[PDB]
Amino acid sequence: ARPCIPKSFGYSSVVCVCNATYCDSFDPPTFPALGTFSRYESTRSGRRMELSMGPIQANHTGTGLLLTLQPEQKFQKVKGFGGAMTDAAALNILALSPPAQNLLLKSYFSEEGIGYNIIRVPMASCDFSIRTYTYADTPDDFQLHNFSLPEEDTKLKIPLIHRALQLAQRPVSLLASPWTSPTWLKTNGAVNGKGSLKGQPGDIYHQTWARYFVKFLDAYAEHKLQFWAVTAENEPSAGLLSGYPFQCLGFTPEHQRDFIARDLGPTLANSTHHNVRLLMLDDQRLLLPHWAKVVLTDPEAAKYVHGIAVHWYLDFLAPAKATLGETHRLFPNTMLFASEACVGSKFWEQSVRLGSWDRGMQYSHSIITNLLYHVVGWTDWNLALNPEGGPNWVRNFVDSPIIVDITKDTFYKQPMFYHLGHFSKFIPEGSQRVGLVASQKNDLDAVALMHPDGSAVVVVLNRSSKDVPLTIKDPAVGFLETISPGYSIHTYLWRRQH
Ligand SMILES: *[C@@H]1O[C@H](CO)[C@@H](O[C@@H]2O[C@H](CO)[C@@H](O)[C@H](O)[C@H]2NC(C)=O)[C@H](O)[C@H]1NC(C)=O
Ligand SMILES: *[C@@H]1O[C@H](CO)[C@@H](O)[C@H](O)[C@H]1NC(C)=O
Ligand SMILES: *[C@@H]1O[C@H](CO)[C@@H](O)[C@H](O)[C@H]1NC(C)=O
Ligand SMILES: O=S(=O)(NCC1CC1)c1ccccc1
Ligand SMILES: [K+]
Ligand SMILES: [K+]
């Protein structure tokens, strides 16, 4: 529909420049003719989700790499993809002119963009906020009569969420997560630092905290917003750490288990919001499987927990098989969901690297890795940041797929945007991962899924410098002869006749 306007900032690849009168966009989505496949290609050399079509062939010869679709080998259903509407994201989006705001939101939420269907909503303030607040800062208000949404919600976040939902043709699911409780419920009486809820699960402090979740859901419902899920606490391990710099609330896994069993589970289940799902953990993967064991082996907690939320700090190394793999083996009926991912968080790397292909490859490699370990969705962190990677009240700056430059009324779409879009645009909610078997050892990363309507999607990432010819075999349908260029990502789509 409209191609990428590239700009280089001296990193390995380009950003696409958008402004008040121009942004890259796709045509309305249409499938290739039966017997035809679509290929969307992005490359370090500068291609951005460019469309080509090719024939599906009856025959194949050669000893080249063959990836054979296993359409009846079924794995997880996919919930979807999206990102977080933090205070920082909202402020950056609304600092753009109305036309640029629209093109940014269309980029993410419309069918002319990459089709996000998840928005994560912080419950009150976090690090990506410029003001520290909760919804119930008046002390000793245990019945939460003075609970209320401030302007960060009513004037910034909620109107933007409504605008995203208007642009979306896919149903959008909202996920809520709190960072801190009111300080008068906490052992340290501060939003940050080491501290937990006072007392013990089942007591007034814990009951009040559980009621705060229902108050939040009630308040958003008055604005005609309903949630798909809540997490039990953002990064519960953080509040156990001396000097933790920003909003947190510490829970051991035993504390989280008992809070869920005695307070949050029953309180949600007794409310009009009983259909909202509860996700546990919302933290880094090295806490698994231990955290899952502690919480889910208690039947009283387990009956309230619908899923496990995991965060991915892509700058840091940690095992996948010993964490996600083991958790799936031990608790195959509890879904895993990636609720936050980010890059650029190390103090010694530029928070925002405009045009970094490497950071793009980190996003897509992460997503593939998550999907191969049974995870049902993937949620980026801040939807948009400034060129510093902010604002952020403790200067904990990071990268974002969209960077806003208010002085030019411009925003920049990073390689990370396109790497995420290779999945989000082409994997509708309810898609199911299926097998994909390589005929020989190779350097590629790939995943295959089947749409609800039976159509096929395959994503192929090449993190190597070498162009790799390959064939995809769909045993019902035929062969797709293609090539995976070095430093590329491709998405393949086709109809499957039986
Ligand atoms: C928004 O960006 C577009 C794209 O760069 C700008 O339009 C370009 O303007 C230059 C300079 O006049 C021309 O050489 C290009 O041909 C234009 N491209 C297109 C596609 O129109 C546009 O001026 C910018 N808008 C604002 C309000 O700054
Ligand atoms: C495909 O395979 C068989 C090989 O004998 C042949 O009958 C057929 O003509 C070949 N070519 C095409 C285009 O199908
Ligand atoms: C359960 O729900 C009702 C609302 O119908 C409420 O009045 C009651 O206090 C709730 N019980 C709790 C939160 O324990
Ligand atoms: O994968 S999709 O079906 N994504 C969803 C779209 C609304 C139908 C698709 C198909 C054709 C072109 C782009 C994307
Ligand atoms: K208040
Ligand atoms: K940094």
UniProtKB/Swiss-Prot annotation:
Keywords, in A-Z order: Cholesterol metabolism, Disease variant, Disulfide bond, Gaucher disease, Glycoprotein, Glycosidase, Glycosyltransferase, Hydrolase, Ichthyosis, Lipid metabolism, Lysosome, Membrane, Neurodegeneration, Parkinson disease, Parkinsonism, Pharmaceutical, Signal, Sphingolipid metabolism, Steroid metabolism, Sterol metabolism, Transferase
Result of altering residue 182 to L: In GD1; very low glucosylceramidase activity
Impact upon substituting residue 161 to N: In GD; decreased glucosylceramidase activity; 5% of normal activity
Phenotypic consequence of residue 212 to H: In GD; uncertain significance
Effect of residue 7 to E: Found in a patient with Parkinson disease; uncertain significance
GO terms assigned for molecular function: galactosylceramidase activity; glucosylceramidase activity; glucosyltransferase activity; scavenger receptor binding; signaling receptor binding; steryl-beta-glucosidase activity
Annotated consequence of substituting residue 353 to G: In GD and GD3
Location of the protein in the cell: Lysosome membrane
Membrane topology, from the record: Peripheral membrane protein
Result of changing residue 370 to S: In GD1; risk factor for Parkinson disease; increased proteasomal degradation; decreased protein abundance; decreased glucosylceramide catabolic process; decreased glucosylceramidase activity; 23% of normal activity when expressed in a heterologous system; alters interaction with saposin-C
Reported function: Glucosylceramidase that catalyzes, within the lysosomal compartment, the hydrolysis of glucosylceramides/GlcCers (such as beta-D-glucosyl-(1<->1')-N-acylsphing-4-enine) into free ceramides (such as N-acylsphing-4-enine) and glucose. Plays a central role in the degradation of complex lipids and the turnover of cellular membranes. Through the production of ceramides, participates in the PKC-activated salvage pathway of ceramide formation. Catalyzes the glucosylation of cholesterol, through a transglucosylation reaction where glucose is transferred from GlcCer to cholesterol.
Disease link: Gaucher disease: An autosomal recessive lysosomal storage disease due to deficient activity of lysosomal beta-glucocerebrosidase, and characterized by accumulation of glucosylceramide in the reticulo-endothelial system. GD is a multisystem disease historically divided into three main subtypes on the basis of the presence of neurologic involvement, age at onset and progression rate: type 1 is the non-neuropathic form, type 2 is the acute neuropathic form with early onset and rapid neurologic deterioration, type 3 is the chronic neuropathic form with slow progression of neurologic features. Gaucher disease 1: A form of Gaucher disease, an autosomal recessive lysosomal storage disease due to deficient activity of lysosomal beta-glucocerebrosidase, and characterized by accumulation of glucosylceramide in the reticulo-endothelial system. GD1 is characterized by hepatosplenomegaly with consequent anemia and thrombopenia, and bone involvement. The central nervous system is not involved.
Protein name stated in the entry: Lysosomal acid glucosylceramidase
Annotated source species: Homo sapiens (Human)
Lineage of source species: Eukaryota, Metazoa, Chordata, Craniata, Vertebrata
Gene that specifies this protein: GBA1
